[PDB]
Structure 1
Amino acid sequence: MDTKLYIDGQWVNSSSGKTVDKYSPVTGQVIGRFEAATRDDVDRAIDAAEDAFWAWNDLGSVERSKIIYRAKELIEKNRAELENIIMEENGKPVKEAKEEVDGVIDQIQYYAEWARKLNGEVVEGTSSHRKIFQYKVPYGIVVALTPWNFPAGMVARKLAPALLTGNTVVLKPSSDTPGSAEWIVRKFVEAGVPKGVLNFITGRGSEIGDYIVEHKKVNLITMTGSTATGQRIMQKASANMAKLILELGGKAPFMVWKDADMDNALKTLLWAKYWNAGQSCIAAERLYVHEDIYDTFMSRFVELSRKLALGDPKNADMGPLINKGALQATSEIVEEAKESGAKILFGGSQPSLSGPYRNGYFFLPTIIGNADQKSKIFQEEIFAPVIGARKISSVEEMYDLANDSKYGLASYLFTKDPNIIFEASERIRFGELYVNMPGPEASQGYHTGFRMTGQAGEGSKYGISEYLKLKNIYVDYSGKPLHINTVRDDLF
């Protein structure tokens, strides 16, 4: 797929004509290309979103929802095409690609269903002949910045609420996964999104990234990705005071109390660690097992991890890392751990793979013992199929080790003690706590976190409302002379 830009109702090339090649993480083969958009291209996209705003707002949420549901229908009817794009660009195992596309469909539906239901308020004024009307209206122009790890799902998650609520949009996907975004945009276009309401820009984040986020006409930035990019966005958005929705991943503690159902905890850990090869904002990143069951738990964890097949999406349990850079950084992480004295219980390198897969970015499930609570393995995001384990003995210690993190997104807890479950619901200072089940998050949840997770959140009533600004209209209908306490009446 050679992708193009979509600006002011047309598919076009970059004004510079420059492009960037895309490689399969499965095989290493070059498989596509995208347009490297210029700054003038960004301006034209943002101005098109400005010019389309008032007519799009004025349509009302019901007419907007019809277009969004038509998009969903077109996506569902042609879903195989999107599943194949994900498998090609990301190397996801087939069931992960199908689930992701199921999630695009579920999310678009969920958000469109908010039509005419996100009410404003009427409150008492300062007299019987005054009222305060509180309208909820759109922010205006939304810049959507999507990551590579859930390249279809994150696009649906941001576009759907933004459009429903009456914002116009400029979308820029990750440079590793332009194809899934393009395909979704084209579906909204086919469904009848009007000229300029939805724009699509690809390019080097290092050439246009700051420029998009600091532009004077941008009202809201919705973004998922790395901590360092998020920090940079918040710095640059000081220029326009844009509203920020930022999700920057985490370092989820996976906590197994002594009374855990072992099979359910292990099932959930295979999912939390190895789903999408650990390239998940909610991946298990630190494992804490009660000392009474640590040895059995770890023996089983290692035995199951060894049975995971890596390779082609048609048949594998786990896919590859996204690019050569992720593979290099994962190798460095493993070597730093070994250099600090950690002990590798399984994995710690690339697999030995046959045919075309020998050239993809595969990395083995990797399980570490003997790493300190204070170590990089336990304090810095890995985003790869690597995890360290440690023993725990008390509930208070469990909460502290968990909360001892600059991150604050997801967490997992396995236990049958009700007092721990109800107490952890406040003491575990993470945005999502999964008790005796796996993620992922549901659309009806508010996906957010504490500390370095980011700003605001997504999903639920509160998530979609993040795309609406509340404004106040103070009316006096007494029809009588005003009396103002500090304005002498003696003047009138």
Structure 2
Amino acid sequence: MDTKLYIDGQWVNSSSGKTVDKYSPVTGQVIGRMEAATRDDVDRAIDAAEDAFWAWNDLGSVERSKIIYRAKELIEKNRAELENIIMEENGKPVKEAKEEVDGVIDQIQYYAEWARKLNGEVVEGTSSHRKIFQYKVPYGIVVALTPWNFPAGMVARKLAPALLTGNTVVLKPSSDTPGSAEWIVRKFVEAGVPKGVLNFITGRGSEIGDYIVEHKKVNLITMTGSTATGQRIMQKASANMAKLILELGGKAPFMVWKDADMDNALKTLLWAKYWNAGQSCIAAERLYVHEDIYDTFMSRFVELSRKLALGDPKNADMGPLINKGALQATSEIVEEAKESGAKILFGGSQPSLSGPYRNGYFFLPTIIGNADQKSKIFQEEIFAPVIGARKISSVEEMYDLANDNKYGLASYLFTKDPNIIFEASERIRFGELYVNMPGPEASQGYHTGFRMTGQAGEGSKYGISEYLKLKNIYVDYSGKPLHINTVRDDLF
């Protein structure tokens, strides 16, 4: 697939004529190219979104919702193509590709359904002939930056609320996954999104990354990705004071209390560690199991993990890592854990596969025993199918170990003790706490976290409300002479 740019209502090439290659993570070979937009291409996109703003705003949320619902319907009718792009670009197992598309459709529906419901407010003024009207309006130009890990889902997550609320958009996806973003944009265009409202830019971070976030006309940046990139964004966006929506790294603790339903804890851990090969912002990244059940728990976890099939999307339980860098990083991580005296209970290397799969970026499920709380494998995001395990014996200890983390997104808890449940609901300082169940997040939740996890959040009434700016109108309708305490009336 050769993907293109979409700027001010037309599909176009990069104005340098330059491109970037797309590699299959399943086979390791080139399967596609995308355009490498220049800064002038970016300026044109941003100017187009500026010019389209007032008419997009004036249409109203209901009319905007009709277009967004239309896009959902076209996506749904032709979902197989999108599922296939995800399998090709990411190597996801077919059921993950299908589930992610299910999420694309669910999100678009959910966000468009907010039409004419995100109300402003009327407040008492400082007299009986004064009121304060509080309107919720769009921020203006939204830059939407989506990561490679959920390359369809994350596009729906950002475009649908930005658009429903009356902002115009310039979307730049990950260069590892341009295809799924392009396809979704195309469907929005087919749905009737007007000229300049939705723009699509691909290119190298090193050429256009700072430029698109620091640009004088940007009003809001909505981004999911790496912590380091979110930090740079926040630095650069000081040039425009853009409203920021950053969802960054996670290091979810997975906590299994002595009274946990073992089977459910273990099903959920297989999901939480190995879904999308651990390439999830809510992946189980630390395992804490009560000492009374630690040995039986770990034995069964290793035995189940042994039964996972890697390989082709058509039949694998688990797919490859996104690119050669992710693979080299993951090996380096495991080798550092080894050189620290961590014990590898299973995995820890790339397997030797045959056929075209020999050159994909496959990594084995990897379980690490008696992992130090202060080690790199406990303190730094891994984003791959590797986890360390540690024993716990008390509730206060469990809370303290979990919160001793620079990340604060998801977390998991298995127990039948209602008091641990309710207490942890406040004591576990994480944006999401999953209790006796797996993720992923729901559209009605507010996907967010504490500490290095970022800024603002996505989903729920509050997430869609992050794309609205509250403004105040103070009116005086007394029809009488003003009296201002610090201004002498004898001047009049």
TM-score (norm 2): 1.00
CA distance in 2, matches of 1:290, 1:122: 52
Structure 2 match to 1:300: 300
Query: Which piece of structure 1 moves more, 346-355 or 460-469?
Result: 346-355
Aligned to 1:410, what secondary structure does the other structure show?
A: coil
Deviations along 1:240-295, one digit per CA (max 9) or x if unpaired, are 00000000020000000000000000000000000000000000000000000000
Deviations along 1:167-222, one digit per CA (max 9) or x if unpaired, are 00000000000000000000000000000000000000111000000001000000
Structure 2 match to 1:469: 469
Alpha-carbon shift at residue 354 of structure 1 (Å): 2.0
Alpha-carbon shift at residue 337 of structure 1 (Å): 0.3
Alpha-carbon shift at residue 316 of structure 1 (Å): 0.1
Alpha-carbon shift at residue 166 of structure 1 (Å): 0.1
CA distance in 2, matches of 1:79, 1:41: 30
- Conservation of the 8 A alpha-carbon contact between 1:341 and 1:370: no
Alpha-carbon shift at residue 145 of structure 1 (Å): 0.1
Aligned to 2:411, what secondary structure does the other structure show?
A: strand
Alpha-carbon shift at residue 355 of structure 1 (Å): 1.1
Deviations along 1:442-470, one digit per CA (max 9) or x if unpaired, are 00000000000000000000000000000
Aligned to 1:344, what secondary structure does the other structure show?
A: strand
CA distance in 2, matches of 1:404, 1:246: 22
- Conservation of the 8 A alpha-carbon contact between 1:171 and 1:198: yes
Structure 1 match to 2:269: 269
Alpha-carbon shift at residue 352 of structure 1 (Å): 2.3
CA distance in 1, matches of 2:29, 2:209: 27
Unpaired runs of 5+ residues, structure 2, are none
CA distance in 1, matches of 2:229, 2:379: 19
Deviations along 1:416-449, one digit per CA (max 9) or x if unpaired, are 0000000000000000000000000000000000
Aligned to 2:121, what secondary structure does the other structure show?
A: strand
Deviations along 1:58-78, one digit per CA (max 9) or x if unpaired, are 000000000000000000000
Alpha-carbon shift at residue 370 of structure 1 (Å): 2.3
Aligned to 1:293, what secondary structure does the other structure show?
A: helix
CA distance in 1, matches of 2:94, 2:72: 21
- Conservation of the 8 A alpha-carbon contact between 1:221 and 1:243: yes
- Segments ≥4 residues shifted beyond 6 Å: none
Alpha-carbon shift at residue 237 of structure 1 (Å): 0.3
Structure 2 match to 1:120: 120
Alpha-carbon shift at residue 236 of structure 1 (Å): 0.2
CA distance in 1, matches of 2:352, 2:280: 25
Alpha-carbon shift at residue 481 of structure 1 (Å): 0.4
CA distance in 1, matches of 2:338, 2:461: 46
Deviations along 1:337-366, one digit per CA (max 9) or x if unpaired, are 000000000001011212111110000000
CA distance in 1, matches of 2:255, 2:370: 17
- Conservation of the 8 A alpha-carbon contact between 1:123 and 1:133: yes
CA distance in 1, matches of 2:394, 2:164: 47
Deviations along 1:12-66, one digit per CA (max 9) or x if unpaired, are 0000000011010000121100000000000000000000000000000000000
CA distance in 2, matches of 1:2, 1:212: 23
Q: Say if 2:416 is the partner of 1:416.
A: yes
CA distance in 2, matches of 1:348, 1:71: 43
Aligned to 1:203, what secondary structure does the other structure show?
A: coil
Unpaired runs of 5+ residues, structure 1, are none
Q: CA RMSD in A?
A: 0.4
- Conservation of the 8 A alpha-carbon contact between 1:176 and 1:322: yes
- Conservation of the 8 A alpha-carbon contact between 1:249 and 1:280: no
Identical-pair percentage: 100
- Conservation of the 8 A alpha-carbon contact between 1:136 and 1:468: yes
Deviations along 1:114-148, one digit per CA (max 9) or x if unpaired, are 00000000000000000000000000000000000
Aligned to 2:470, what secondary structure does the other structure show?
A: strand
CA distance in 2, matches of 1:205, 1:145: 11
CA distance in 2, matches of 1:183, 1:352: 34
CA distance in 2, matches of 1:190, 1:143: 21
Aligned to 2:311, what secondary structure does the other structure show?
A: coil
Q: Say if 2:201 is the partner of 1:222.
A: no
Alpha-carbon shift at residue 371 of structure 1 (Å): 1.9
Structure 2 match to 1:12: 12
Deviations along 1:217-245, one digit per CA (max 9) or x if unpaired, are 00000000000000000000000000000
CA distance in 1, matches of 2:14, 2:384: 34
